[PDB]
Amino acid sequence: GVKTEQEDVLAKELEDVNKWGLHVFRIAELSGNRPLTVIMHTIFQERDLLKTFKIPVDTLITYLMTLEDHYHADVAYHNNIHAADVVQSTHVLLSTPALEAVFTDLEILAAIFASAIHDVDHPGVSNQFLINTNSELALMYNDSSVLENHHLAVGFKLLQEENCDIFQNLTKKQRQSLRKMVIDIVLATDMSKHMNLLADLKTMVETKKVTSSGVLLLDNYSDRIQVLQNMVHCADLSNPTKPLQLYRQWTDRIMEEFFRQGDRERERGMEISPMCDKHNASVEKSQVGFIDYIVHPLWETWADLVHPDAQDILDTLEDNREWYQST
Numbered sequence: 001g002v003k004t005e006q007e008d009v010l011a012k013e014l015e016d017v018n019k020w021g022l023h024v025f026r027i028a029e030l031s032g033n034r035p036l037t038v039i040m041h042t043i044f045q046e047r048d049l050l051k052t053f054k055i056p057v058d059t060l061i062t063y064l065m066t067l068e069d070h071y072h073a074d075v076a077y078h079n080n081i082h083a084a085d086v087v088q089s090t091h092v093l094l095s096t097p098a099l100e101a102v103f104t105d106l107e108i109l110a111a112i113f114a115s116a117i118h119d120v121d122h123p124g125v126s127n128q129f130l131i132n133t134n135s136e137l138a139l140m141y142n143d144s145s146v147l148e149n150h151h152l153a154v155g156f157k158l159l160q161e162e163n164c165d166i167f168q169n170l171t172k173k174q175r176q177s178l179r180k181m182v183i184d185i186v187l188a189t190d191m192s193k194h195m196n197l198l199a200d201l202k203t204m205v206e207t208k209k210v211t212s213s214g215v216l217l218l219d220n221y222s223d224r225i226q227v228l229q230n231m232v233h234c235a236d237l238s239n240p241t242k243p244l245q246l247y248r249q250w251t252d253r254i255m256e257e258f259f260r261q262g263d264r265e266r267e268r269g270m271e272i273s274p275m276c277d278k279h280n281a282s283v284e285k286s287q288v289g290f291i292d293y294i295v296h297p298l299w300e301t302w303a304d305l306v307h308p309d310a311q312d313i314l315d316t317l318e319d320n321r322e323w324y325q326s327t
Ligand SMILES: COc1ccc(C2=NN(C(C)C)C(=O)[C@@H]3CC=CC[C@H]23)cc1C#CC(=O)NCc1ccccc1
Pocket: 189, 191, 236, 237, 239, 240, 250, 251, 254, 274, 275, 283, 286, 287, 289, 290, 293, 294
């Protein structure tokens, strides 16, 4: 009852779980394509979430495997590795010193669970694509945040699977609170909400309060959920803040996915999408624009909220930005 050698090299990689720039791809490999399961497990143990919420470990594992298996292995970007990465990144963001002892264990569980489910059963195409193709998912969710609503529905329906109810010992009060938070968080990962989340984050930073010296004061649900919503959205838009070896893989995967959507948008005679076209796109200027217009404004406002904790991350983003510019 000691680890195999593979289990051991995995456990040594997993000591980076609290670091920005974990070797998540390596984790995926070493875990037999189980990054989401192993990383969630580690985080749950680290944060003592099993004891706090009286989660049987077999139940946790069973749910996690089930959740991981409803990510599509044939989708290059929006798969279980991306889920794992958003989870781990949210995990690191929650540990930021500006937020020390701000959040309850239920809010922590919410942010992390939300991260893990937030792209589950993603088909590798966009909301617009789905809406324009008259897809069942678009009709189900009356064309409004189609994917997000689906990810939430799937992540919650899976709890009904044999020995999958990880929330089985929570009170009704706890469950209702957790559910609301998770819905609010995942719905906020729809890029059509980015501007309003960013605005709200900007106004919160201007009127920012602090107590005991250092630590943010959030004394209402609106503010509390806003911070968690923006935290996970930062995690979701965190690829360009990661070391370049990591960042480049992410870009490659998203391009495959978008070019493949583009291929389907000519295989279907449709109108091609913003940056979804091979022998006809600049990958580098698009990334620069992605960084200038979306990723930097968000991370700069975050870094401002948690000053000085996000400096190295904002630095790395600015370096990667310079790097991509040279081409
Ligand atoms: C690592 O790169 C990426 C990683 C992620 C995304 C995502 N984009 N969007 C929207 C912004 C198109 C999503 O809704 C996705 C779903 C959820 C969140 C983020 C996802 C885009 C890129 C890129 C790029 C790239 O080269 N040109 C694309 C681009 C160029 C200029 C301006 C905006 C985008």
